[PDB]
Amino acid sequence: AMETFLFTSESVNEGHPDKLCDQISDAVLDACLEQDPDSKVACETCTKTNMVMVFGEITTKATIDYEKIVRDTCRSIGFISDDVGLDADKCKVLVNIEQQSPDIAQGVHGHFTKRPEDIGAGDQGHMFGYATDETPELMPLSHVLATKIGARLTEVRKNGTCRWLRPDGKTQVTVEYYNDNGAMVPVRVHTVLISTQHDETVTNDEIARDLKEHVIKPIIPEKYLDDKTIFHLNPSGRFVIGGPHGDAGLTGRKIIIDTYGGWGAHGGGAFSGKDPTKVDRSGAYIVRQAAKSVVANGMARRALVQVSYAIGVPEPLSVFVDTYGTGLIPDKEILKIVKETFDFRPGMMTINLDLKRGGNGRFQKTAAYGHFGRDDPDFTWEVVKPLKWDKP
Amino acid sequence: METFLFTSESVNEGHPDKLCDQISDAVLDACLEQDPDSKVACETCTKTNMVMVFGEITTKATIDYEKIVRDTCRSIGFISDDVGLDADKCKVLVNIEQQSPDIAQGVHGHFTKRPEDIGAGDQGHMFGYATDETPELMPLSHVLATKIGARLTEVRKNGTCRWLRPDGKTQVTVEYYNDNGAMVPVRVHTVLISTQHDETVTNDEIARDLKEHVIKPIIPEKYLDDKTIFHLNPSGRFVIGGPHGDAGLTGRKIIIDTYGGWGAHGGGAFSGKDPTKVDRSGAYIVRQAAKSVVANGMARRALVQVSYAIGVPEPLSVFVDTYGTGLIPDKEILKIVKETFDFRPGMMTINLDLKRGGNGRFQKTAAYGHFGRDDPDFTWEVVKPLKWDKPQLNN
Numbered sequence A: 001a002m003e004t005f006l007f008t009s010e011s012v013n014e015g016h017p018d019k020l021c022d023q024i025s026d027a028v029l030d031a032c033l034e035q036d037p038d039s040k041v042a043c044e045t046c047t048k049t050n051m052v053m054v055f056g057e058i059t060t061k062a063t064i065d066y067e068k069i070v071r072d073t074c075r076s077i078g079f080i081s082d083d084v085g086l087d088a089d090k091c092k093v094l095v096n097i098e099q100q101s102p103d104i105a106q107g108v109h110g111h112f113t114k115r116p117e118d119i120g121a122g123d124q125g126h127m128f129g130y131a132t133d134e135t136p137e138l139m140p141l142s143h144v145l146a147t148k149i150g151a152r153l154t155e156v157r158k159n160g161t162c163r164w165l166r167p168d169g170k171t172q173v174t175v176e177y178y179n180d181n182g183a184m185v186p187v188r189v190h191t192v193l194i195s196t197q198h199d200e201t202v203t204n205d206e207i208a209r210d211l212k213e214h215v216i217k218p219i220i221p222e223k224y225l226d227d228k229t230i231f232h233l234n235p236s237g238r239f240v241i242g243g244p245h246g247d248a249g250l251t252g253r254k255i256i257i258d259t260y261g262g263w264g265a266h267g268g269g270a271f272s273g274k275d276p277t278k279v280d281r282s283g284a285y286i287v288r289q290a291a292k293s294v295v296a297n298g299m300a301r302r303a304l305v306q307v308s309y310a311i312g313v314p315e316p317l318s319v320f321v322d323t324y325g326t327g328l329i330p331d332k333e334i335l336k337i338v339k340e341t342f343d344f345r346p347g348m349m350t351i352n353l354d355l356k357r358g359g360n361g362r363f364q365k366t367a368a369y370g371h372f373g374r375d376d377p378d379f380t381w382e383v384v385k386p387l388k389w390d391k392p
Numbered sequence B: 001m002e003t004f005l006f007t008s009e010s011v012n013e014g015h016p017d018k019l020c021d022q023i024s025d026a027v028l029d030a031c032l033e034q035d036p037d038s039k040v041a042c043e044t045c046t047k048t049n050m051v052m053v054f055g056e057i058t059t060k061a062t063i064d065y066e067k068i069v070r071d072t073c074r075s076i077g078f079i080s081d082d083v084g085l086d087a088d089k090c091k092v093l094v095n096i097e098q099q100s101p102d103i104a105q106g107v108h109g110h111f112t113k114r115p116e117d118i119g120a121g122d123q124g125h126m127f128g129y130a131t132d133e134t135p136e137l138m139p140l141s142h143v144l145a146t147k148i149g150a151r152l153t154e155v156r157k158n159g160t161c162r163w164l165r166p167d168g169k170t171q172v173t174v175e176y177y178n179d180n181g182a183m184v185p186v187r188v189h190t191v192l193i194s195t196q197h198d199e200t201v202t203n204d205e206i207a208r209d210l211k212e213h214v215i216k217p218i219i220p221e222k223y224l225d226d227k228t229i230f231h232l233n234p235s236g237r238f239v240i241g242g243p244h245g246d247a248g249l250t251g252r253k254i255i256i257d258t259y260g261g262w263g264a265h266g267g268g269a270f271s272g273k274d275p276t277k278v279d280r281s282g283a284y285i286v287r288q289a290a291k292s293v294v295a296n297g298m299a300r301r302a303l304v305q306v307s308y309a310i311g312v313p314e315p316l317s318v319f320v321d322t323y324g325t326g327l328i329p330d331k332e333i334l335k336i337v338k339e340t341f342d343f344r345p346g347m348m349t350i351n352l353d354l355k356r357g358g359n360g361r362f363q364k365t366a367a368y369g370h371f372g373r374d375d376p377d378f379t380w381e382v383v384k385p386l387k388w389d390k391p392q393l394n395n
């Protein structure tokens, strides 16, 4: 028998209270950038029963309505009554937003005077990019399936297929994998879990039926489902209270759901609410582009890339490439090609990925359903770069 | 000798995110001291002149959340607007409710489920990691960044560097060699420190004092050489700091809390959570498992994943990988792990004594990492003997 192992990833949909915060933070960023592309934004959000607070550091020429951005974001997600766990028109909106520290501003951007090539990293830290040939979008299947199931769970609520749904939901997929000389080859889906908020009109048997038929079966390729696949469907047995009423939310508390579902690696930095001088976001986006380009150019079946920075220093402190033994040329050669092709300086990454463009929900769209593996053209870091190499 | 560069960072107890982790766990400690069965999901945030604690607590404890906040800030050194937050003058906001009854019924039956029947407090997945590259079975990049930050706090509190303020960050790039899947440190390539300071010190003095008093005492001499790069307060001015300089939140340092980018992370934060939250108890048990695999000599490195569904005691999946370093097959290590560790949350809670708080039990975890610590309160660092047939023995 084939040797296999089990790997699990989860997701949450746009109504989860932490994801609500990510989306509000990015809605604030979008609003700032639409009026002032040079906005310095570090917008955190938190939420609990009938309360949202936006807090952090914004230096902008924009005139912003923080309250309206909060209410508008809540409304689009479906938080329009106390019965669904937050009412956009009732909740108290608190604001604690100040200009960026002048001590940070002078060292990072010289108070809006540094040229792009001289812009310092907005902070220290490290960031990883990952790609794998196991799906067409070059993302891990466990992550892709959990994420797409959660997006479908939102879609069947909004389109009237499952009218009993409420906004807050989570998903989890256990994939049975084969290791093919370091490449990951999915075999089957071992376990699928959904926990979704619901109204008082639906039985648990109806929830289970409707989740399997309307949400799971449309998303998981048939070749990965069999009679042994385990289903956990609303295992708590009651999920009527939800949203911020059921669970406090914060920005940047879904960073593995935002990235690779536990595959690759994570350096710890959150994405939402941050302008592109924050290398947590621009640097993670460029190393996704790099890892994805290595795999898409056929140089490897899987790739991991690390970059690291120091506040106020344009050039990265370190870069790493690992192909898990799948590279067709040595990893040191791939590192050389990556370092010749990608400009890791933040002012450069910002321009090369058009990251000062907000509005029409540019960043808000990234703040649910993952930052990576998305074909929307606003996800500029998913565009593959041609790499110069001699295929042996 | 082919090498690669791997970087980890840390922050010390005065970083605004870490201040939030410590407040969250100070709240947990206070609840558990009086009511070991407290249900706690305490989030904290902070910005200029403001701390908010919020979330879900079901406790019999007689608690003043504002006092816990102010005491925790005060103890870290946030005693004035000049250092970035005044523990005694700042606004303290509280938005704390009982746990959802819909969660309470499914997880613990409103305090009626026996330990073996307690459901996971949530879904999710968690990873544990160990590596033989340090005595504490942790990655060197992480250990060095973490210990440098701890020393950065120590030299402020002990009067070695009087110009220091509480908020500081560190970062270490280690040059590594791959020995058949085992990680062998070669040298430290780059060290970075950014620390808050007063107006009395020049950048030359900061660089000197950080190298001589903070870095050289921590990094083994064998890893430093005349090519090691030092970035010391590269921004050039860090006088504003703490919550005044940067908003903080609970659970925004989850890689600093764990393995510094090594191993893997399932995304769940630790601080502010009672042990029915498998984000904390499950991560602690899979650290104990990975550490036990390496400490028993069964592998040089090990990664363990576990996953859960809310309301279900038994995990949905378990994975073991030894990066090609195992001395028995990974499938056999997985079998031994499953036979040795009880992954059910009510069981993990008792086996790791996780309902004991007070005397700073959990607050001590909320800075300087949850793993690789020798304090006996870190019960998940105790190695379990594992039963296996060592290849080098007949018996």
Ligand SMILES: C[S@@+](CC[C@H](N)C(=O)[O-])C[C@H]1O[C@@H](n2cnc3c(N)ncnc32)[C@H](O)[C@@H]1O
Pocket (backbone or CB within 6 Å): A016, A017, A018, A168, A169, A170, A195, A196, A236, A237, A238, A239, A240, A241, A242, A243, A246, A247, A248, B040, B041, B056, B099, B100, B102, B103, B106, B121, B122, B310
């Ligand atoms: C289970 S709550 C986390 C722990 C919680 N803070 C506590 O007080 O125990 C985490 C997420 O699970 C979901 N959730 C909320 N209520 C639930 C319920 N009754 N059953 C299942 N999942 C639920 C929501 O997506 C929520 O944001």
Ligand SMILES: C[S@@+](CC[C@H](N)C(=O)[O-])C[C@H]1O[C@@H](n2cnc3c(N)ncnc32)[C@H](O)[C@@H]1O
Pocket (backbone or CB within 6 Å): A041, A042, A057, A100, A101, A103, A104, A107, A122, A123, A311, B015, B016, B017, B167, B168, B169, B194, B195, B235, B236, B237, B238, B239, B240, B241, B242, B245, B246, B247
């Ligand atoms: C650089 S701030 C993060 C970005 C910030 N929110 C903004 O508005 O740009 C992150 C951390 O860096 C540190 N920091 C604050 N001010 C700094 C400065 N002037 N120089 C270097 N590091 C600083 C503190 O530890 C702070 O919590």
Ligand SMILES: [K+]
Pocket (backbone or CB within 6 Å): A247, A248, A249, B041, B043, B055
């Ligand atoms: K929470």
Ligand SMILES: [K+]
Pocket (backbone or CB within 6 Å): A042, A044, A056, B246, B247, B248
């Ligand atoms: K922040």
Ligand SMILES: [Mg+2]
Pocket (backbone or CB within 6 Å): A018, A248, A249, A250, A253
């Ligand atoms: Mg959360």
Ligand SMILES: [Mg+2]
Pocket (backbone or CB within 6 Å): A123, A124, A125, A268, A269, A280
């Ligand atoms: Mg960071």
Ligand SMILES: [Mg+2]
Pocket (backbone or CB within 6 Å): B017, B247, B248, B249, B252
């Ligand atoms: Mg932070």
Ligand SMILES: [Mg+2]
Pocket (backbone or CB within 6 Å): B122, B123, B124, B267, B268, B279
């Ligand atoms: Mg979680």
